[PDB]
Design an enzyme around this catalytic site. Sequence first.
Site, PDB file in Angstrom:
ATOM      1  N   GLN A  73      -8.659   1.283  10.886  1.00 14.07           N
ATOM      2  CA  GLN A  73      -7.854   1.849  11.895  1.00 14.07           C
ATOM      3  C   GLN A  73      -8.095   1.689  13.426  1.00 14.07           C
ATOM      4  OE1 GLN A  73      -5.213   3.136  10.655  1.00 14.07           O
ATOM      5  NE2 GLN A  73      -5.508   3.874   8.481  1.00 14.07           N
TER       6      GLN A  73
ATOM      7  N   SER B 209       2.327  -0.137   5.849  1.00 12.27           N
ATOM      8  CA  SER B 209       1.882  -1.398   6.060  1.00 12.27           C
ATOM      9  C   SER B 209       2.968  -2.535   5.576  1.00 12.27           C
ATOM     10  CB  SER B 209       0.480  -1.601   5.203  1.00 12.27           C
ATOM     11  OG  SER B 209      -0.402  -0.694   5.396  1.00 12.27           O
TER      12      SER B 209
ATOM     13  N   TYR C  70      -9.239  -6.353   5.305  1.00 11.57           N
ATOM     14  CA  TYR C  70      -7.722  -5.733   5.934  1.00 11.57           C
ATOM     15  C   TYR C  70      -8.146  -4.613   6.879  1.00 11.57           C
ATOM     16  CZ  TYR C  70      -3.307  -3.572   5.070  1.00 11.57           C
ATOM     17  OH  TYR C  70      -1.957  -3.248   5.605  1.00 11.57           O
TER      18      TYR C  70
ATOM     19  N   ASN D 267       2.526   8.804  -1.430  1.00 11.84           N
ATOM     20  CA  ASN D 267       1.525   7.843  -1.407  1.00 11.84           C
ATOM     21  C   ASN D 267       0.991   7.818  -3.019  1.00 11.84           C
ATOM     22  OD1 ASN D 267      -0.318   5.626  -0.923  1.00 11.84           O
ATOM     23  ND2 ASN D 267      -1.523   6.796   0.662  1.00 11.84           N
TER      24      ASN D 267
ATOM     25  N   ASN E  71      -5.631  -2.464  10.328  1.00  7.83           N
ATOM     26  CA  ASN E  71      -4.557  -2.368  11.073  1.00  7.83           C
ATOM     27  C   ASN E  71      -4.896  -2.942  12.629  1.00  7.83           C
ATOM     28  OD1 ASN E  71      -2.877  -1.375   9.376  1.00  7.83           O
ATOM     29  ND2 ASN E  71      -3.718   0.891   9.683  1.00  7.83           N
TER      30      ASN E  71
ATOM     31  N   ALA F 158       1.757   2.058   2.975  1.00 13.20           N
ATOM     32  CA  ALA F 158       1.560   3.370   2.738  1.00 13.20           C
ATOM     33  C   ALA F 158       1.400   4.038   4.071  1.00 13.20           C
ATOM     34  CB  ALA F 158       0.626   3.710   1.874  1.00 13.20           C
TER      35      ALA F 158
END
EC number: 3.5.2.6
Lengths: 399, 424, 425
Positions: B150, B94, B180, B373, B182, B348
């Site tokens: 995602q 990220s 948050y 991670n 992606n 991560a």
Amino acid sequence: QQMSPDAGLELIRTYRKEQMSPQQINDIVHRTITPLIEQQKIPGMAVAVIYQGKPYYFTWGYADIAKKQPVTQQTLFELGSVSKTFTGVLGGDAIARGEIKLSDPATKYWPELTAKQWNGITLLHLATYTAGGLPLQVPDEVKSSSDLLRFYQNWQPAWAPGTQRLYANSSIGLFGALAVKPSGLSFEQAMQTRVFQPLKLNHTWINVPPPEEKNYAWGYREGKAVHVSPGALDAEAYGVKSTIEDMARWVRSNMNPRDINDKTLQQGIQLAQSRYWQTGDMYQGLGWEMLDWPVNPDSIINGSGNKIALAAHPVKAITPPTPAVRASWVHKTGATGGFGSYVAFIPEKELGIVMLANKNYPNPARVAAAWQILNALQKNEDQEILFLLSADQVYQLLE
Amino acid sequence: QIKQILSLIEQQMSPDAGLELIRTYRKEQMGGGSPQQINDIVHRTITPLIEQQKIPGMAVAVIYQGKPYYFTWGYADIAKKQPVTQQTLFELGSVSKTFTGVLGGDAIARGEIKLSDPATKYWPELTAKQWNGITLLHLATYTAGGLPLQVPDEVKSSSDLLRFYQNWQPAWAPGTQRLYANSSIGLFGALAVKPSGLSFEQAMQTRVFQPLKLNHTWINVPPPEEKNYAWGYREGKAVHVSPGALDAEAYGVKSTIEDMARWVRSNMNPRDINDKTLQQGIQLAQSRYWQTGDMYQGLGWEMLDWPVNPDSIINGSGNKIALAAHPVKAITPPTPAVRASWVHKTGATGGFGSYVAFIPEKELGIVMLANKNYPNPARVAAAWQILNALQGGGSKNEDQEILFLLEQLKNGELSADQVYQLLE
Amino acid sequence: QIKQILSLIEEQQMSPDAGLELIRTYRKEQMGGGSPQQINDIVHRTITPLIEQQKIPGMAVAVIYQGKPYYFTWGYADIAKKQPVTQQTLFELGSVSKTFTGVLGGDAIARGEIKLSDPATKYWPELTAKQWNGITLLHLATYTAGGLPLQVPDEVKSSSDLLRFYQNWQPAWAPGTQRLYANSSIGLFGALAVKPSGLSFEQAMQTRVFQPLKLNHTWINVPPPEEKNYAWGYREGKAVHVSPGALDAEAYGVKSTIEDMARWVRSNMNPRDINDKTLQQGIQLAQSRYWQTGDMYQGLGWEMLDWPVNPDSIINGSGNKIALAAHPVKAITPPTPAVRASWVHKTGATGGFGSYVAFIPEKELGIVMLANKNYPNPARVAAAWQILNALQGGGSKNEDQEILFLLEQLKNGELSADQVYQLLE
């Protein structure tokens, strides 16, 4: 000449301007303003034209009719709402000084203001008439600081902040009142030391000193001689008086901030012309109003009319605020009970006009005359050249 | 000298002020920022972190007064007995978004986009009703209305992606919640490069990497570099981030500890960059667009007011909080990059854990790349320990209570001599 | 042209051998040539089917033609990492390490530190068993000690464990009568040959062979900053690396790159350009012919055949059925000095690596084949023979003997110029 069209358009405009210190200035100023004075019954008028960074002044009429006193280059006119351009710039100065943020809520600077509807209202909202329905005027009954606090704590909004833009004196008035609270100074002292004196505007007054009332011209409404009657937050919204020389200096300074020894005030002048909101083809600055240049004349002319300019429009948040575009028509109308003022300039072409009159005559006439003057000094049909950029086809399509 | 600080502590000493000064005087008293003290605190913090979290290999960069110090532990390839080096490539995860944000910022400085432009302007085929008021700012700051964490693994074509976004049901109106994701900032990055005519990889290469001489940073690791590409380790297994839709924009950058130190330095001091739109781009990427608790959302970067409450960033980095929805108040207009900030980002992948954090006014910074991670609070806690120790102070209770003693000397009461006797 | 050659041979100005060689290059260049293109073509056309047939993950091949190296890479040094084979990739040489060991021994001889005719017990006195009486360093270096076992036992893990291993060993033959390929033999030879220097084997090899030759990426132990280039070996699909063992450094433990190995082959082809005098003599001694078995001569690590060779003999003889069997040896007394008209080669393998090295010194020709899978020896020797033979002209022993007969009569009488021309064309 197989040229990059970008430079071709503007440079073609500049050669077309090279076609025609042109005393043409005197000519077009007379041919445009004289029919305006006669047509509007304007007792006295001071007009300044900034061409290539240089001022050319022109004075007609009487500053005091009954006293046969003429309008001189030292006559003081009531700037009216043009005062906001000062307020805005002063606000900008504070932003540059690290004293305020436009994103800060209003109550950060008025702690005693606690009403619930004042939680999401920011200094930017007050400065840009986007707070959600502040009234065009502070009520006459407001005559004290607790009277004022009482007026605002009991104001109830029409809309949520940042959604609607309604021109109001109470909005940017309270904005100006708050932007100086972190300074310690009052609004008068702040404006005097941070804007006027650094630019050497030595005959611009929030309060006319009695040794200067001789130059304070009368305003004329319905044939009677009037002066702006006092009010709350009047210094922030409509209560500045200046001469045509000091106003010409004002336009010179708002076109070339990089010539000012004051750095904070320079950045503030730049911040006052940043594009925070859009409505139609108009961008809202700090006091100043901007459009893109070249501009549609019927749009600024019809848009200056109080039928539109007082009507609430929705706004588009411009994030981030577009920094001061030089290809802009920056302007502001002003008016009091007896005076009518207009300021407009194009910074990229170093052009400007100030029009002060001791009669309040409709804004469309002022924007119209100023458009004719600055227009003849140098269109959307022209920008067809960018699409037209062979050689004989251009020269023949023009000839 | 300390007596002059105490005697100054009158309106000749502020809330912070004397706390900061006593911190750097305590720095002078202990070591004084020695190239030894750096190694010492870095070892005493990172070594127990590695042993506790079972981290196969790690690289750490410390920027102190604008100077990088590199530190390496462990193995980039366990089986191959390959050690982590300063040329080892880690998966940033990220943290890649900090690049995307900056790239987006550059696009703004070029006049190719405006954060207030609507998403549909650059992707007209995105015709669903829910996309009407969603702008690039919403996508870049996770405030579009609840885009999913995602992009689904099965999204592998342009039509699959279009259908993915068309079928998305927002849980909130734009500009009210931060979730948050992606898909949000990934879509932002993909859209922001369309006016340039370049691909995301090409725009990133020519507009961020190359101007910054980030010559060992990759969205796609070229074949002669695979020997430096460290293995990620998840439950003992070696793993690498698989390709996915919009990965380049969200989590697909690979870099070395050196290149990462140069990245942090470039974001601390953009004034040394020849590229102007890249400098303004960094400035815009550290602007504050929304606030949530004590946190401000930039373009990829996240910022807090310095000095920071350590418990707030440490606890707030945990995924229970970091991935939850929170309400935002808009900072309109956005505040320009505040130098008195703690600017950071976690990153991560399946088998990598990375963290970046810097304080610009103090020229202080840290990069932590690891090929496992491990939980975010461990990374942010270690980083706070290191940066705190290196800037002067120690212990949050000592900082609050020492601020209390100084406030007592201010409000008469303690008076120079008794404060000093308590301090020494 | 050929006319000029035949006429010059009539005019005594050329040997029928020089006529043979020059004619060889002429009809070599008649259709193909010695262009860097013929190399690329024959290498591609030979190694590609080898890789596809033997299922070889990654490979590097160096071809030395007229002393210049040409490098070739296929496949992956690390499959999982998608890491390609490069000229800096490290392969496990396996038994090819013995060529280094031998040469190091040769250097030791050139330094006056050892004698191949000294008994092994001279350098390891604690080796007191009776069977060691007539066993010399030459015996150990050439697999003729009397039946030393192919491997040193895995349970041998200390110096004393090694001593017990050698003391209790039962020879099947008298020294100098049988050749049995074995790691224990030449491994012990290498370990003993460095003892008078006071250095360890790793130290002697590093400072006395690797460093003088600028073999800067050749390792007995791969240092940690080099592990990124150490390719994975592949045996039955799994990645593998050679485990430590007794005497591994001396017998099979060297790792090198295709570049360094190209320099190794060039150094053994033309030792005359090496500043290190004792290393140059060492190479020369390592290519001396000490024993004969069939058509094969045993050097110090290197094995030599007369060039041109019967290809089926090296191909079939490289197979483990023959290469690992016992065969009787004829002593070449005294050893023949390094014959340049030789096929000098050595095969090597580990669990997951297969390598081969072969060069012809008189023709300045050479090939290195490093691969990270252990595939059968005959395939390697066949590929190398096809490539080098093709690059040398066309060869064949019977052919060269016939042309040599026509040229011998050319120098005599019988044929005369235009005859030999007609018969050749």
